[PDB]
């Protein structure tokens, strides 16, 4: 339980001294973000710690971050950390490694071009209209609104239609079989008891795989696998969704196997579902607690889109203050918290030796709130991202979507999705705090960047 | 227990149908060689089977064998099969993989040049004199001699002196601490209950490694590790052995770490100890049961080395009939039985697709006795290897030392070692069957190519 706990000592790298077997995981009692902030503050630009026996090297120099995420991505820093028993989802692009990831990224990148996105915009926009209709119910009864619920439904609606052409008002069909399955693809809490145990007993992962025990719910993955087979078999006899693009990609490296395709369909839900709804909720919390910013944003929207004109791909990209609001919220709440890459081979990068097998970690949350780069980092200040000020932002300090060849493949889609939701909602409503609104917002101490209590807000119709 | 058991069926490759969990391991009840001979006979040039869940593709075409062992060695077929919990012996050259093997092979190849070998010959020759002295005791009492005992002692003597400068008459110091340790580095029986269980439960290997349970005896490896540290620390203050060559290589890729060095010292014992003594025993069994061949060999020795002249590097390499006898015995008894390489990536080689992760196996024992290539393959016929006949021998059918960049690194040393022993012994003695000699020889049904009963022979002094 100590074998590798001498590594950073031998390399002269500072960090919290690890306990046998556990390493440093007891320092996670306040979650990832507080641990990373405290280590940054007390150890400086680089430090190392141990998740069980696994050494993790944290780096904060932007030039070093570029070398890892960009310059040496294919040669040395290709893969993320393996995390638990995964079964056939081994073929999902975010979990695949080395040449197999490189292949999958090539097969799937044409699916995320601006041209495919623009062709999807009318689809996503339809569910913004559904969102507004549902919000209007509660704006009329005066009941406070739980944001994760309404933005969760929106997120689900956009996924099911843009992924499979499945058109559902999920907020009002919460027991449609397709919705009750996809709702279960939530983000993993890596500080929960199962994942803590796997970190201390990583040698048990092969035992779980041989028993077909999978961190992705078996019932959900099998429902989706058989649903997809049915859509594929259909369709053929008699759409601009991700499934159709992937189906088309199967007829011209060696094509995308049928199982590989279902794995991507599932991982796209997992990657986009709770991420989008969380960020939307943080944004509306910031707008509700900064009425001046909400008004300025509604003024911009009304100017670009007079008389509640429906948003379009081009009109969205025109809105600079909208972009500034989205960007500043993601500075405060980079829901990934950390970026990680395994070091595949002994390397020396910009001054320091990094041994094979170390996980190199970029603490996005901590860098996003680092006073060296950000004046008053705890304040919500969209003007940081104005054309005036934004040139002073280092792209390797601000990394809410990662960076380089393995960054977020759905970044453009997620930005466009969230902005289209925000536009439609703000055209129709203003959001204000309740007495049940938690002000200021407290973050959870678990493994997910989420509010301590669900955000709840009053919705008032601008009509 | 069936996941991968459909692979050869899907590829249209024949082979014995596997049972759940076990695969084909129940067919090992007569050992590796009989299983490989029977499959070759009933399935043809290629077949597949499963060691538990691991698929193994057997190949017999010499052009395909060259492609695997030679042409695509670095790109695709670099590594042997992982086999059990190995601990720090992970750094031993025969167990290392990919770039780390390539590095170790580069660091260690200068240690096995003809020039280093010739410099070692006086050392090895000294223990041939010790062998003869010990044999003479039993040639005088008339007691039959157990070959593995006398050739085991010889093998040990040559190792301890050529590896560490440790000069011991091990047959008469059988409880010297250094001898009692090195005697334990015997070949693994992969059909024994532990290794059968590991084959059926390969998922338990990580559990064993985390508990520091190692297939190499811990007490032996630690005795040798501390012995080596003592020799290294000594020596320095105040030799042409492998240790000295490796020590010298540490002062000019990034040099050979201290632990890496001890790992090679241990693996060289493991690789050469029981291998050399087994082959010597097979050779003397063939000479004793073919007196005409033994006489012709003694006649050649007496002609090259009149009046029991001591053998030299150059005189050994002059003896053609000696070479033919050694080579034909190794045709009958290729103690490795099989050569193996893991397929690192999907490839198509000479006509057939081979998927990633399959073990490609070359059944040396079966090819060595294949009637297509060998007239009367069960007969001991040294004239096969005469300059007359030897051009008709395919170097990828006859592979007692493997082939290509990852062949036996100690091949020249082992040949020179065995020949020097045979020369000295045959200069002084003739070996004849006893009534306790098993004729014809029966092979064991376990996992090692060894006689069923120990070979025992009468030794008669030519004086
Ligand atoms: C606001 C919403 C989202 C945020 C903040 C976000 C953030 C991130 C981050 C930080 C990464 C890691 C990048 C790196 O390691 O350098 C990532 C990866 C990824 N995201 Fe997103 N993401 C979001 C939405 C989405 C959506 C909607 C999709 C799919 C439609 C998606 C698909 C992926 C995939 C596949 C990866 C792994 C890429 C690869 O391994 O090649 N994400 N995301
Ligand atoms: C008659 C005695 C010996 C026989 C029949 C023999 C046979 C073999 C065979 C068939 C291989 C596998 C080659 C392949 O996979 O293509 C091998 C590998 C090897 N042998 Fe030998 N061997 C003998 C003696 C020795 C000795 C004396 C040493 C060391 C001094 C040695 C060191 C090695 C090593 C290190 C490997 C692995 C090479 C690598 O992985 O790079 N062997 N041997």
Swiss-Prot record, chains A, B:
What do the Gene Ontology cellular component annotations say?
cytoplasm; endoplasmic reticulum membrane; intracellular membrane-bounded organelle
Functional description taken from the UniProt entry: A cytochrome P450 monooxygenase involved in the metabolism of sterols, steroid hormones, retinoids and fatty acids. Mechanistically, uses molecular oxygen inserting one oxygen atom into a substrate, and reducing the second into a water molecule, with two electrons provided by NADPH via cytochrome P450 reductase (NADPH--hemoprotein reductase). Catalyzes the hydroxylation of carbon-hydrogen bonds.
Intracellular or extracellular location(s) = Endoplasmic reticulum membrane; Microsome membrane
Which molecular function terms from Gene Ontology are attached? Answer: 1,8-cineole 2-exo-monooxygenase activity; 1-alpha,25-dihydroxyvitamin D3 23-hydroxylase activity; anandamide 11,12 epoxidase activity; anandamide 14,15 epoxidase activity; anandamide 8,9 epoxidase activity; caffeine oxidase activity; enzyme binding; estrogen 16-alpha-hydroxylase activity
The protein in question is named Cytochrome P450 3A4
Q: Which cofactors does this protein require?
A: heme
Activation and inhibition: Activated by cytochrome b5.
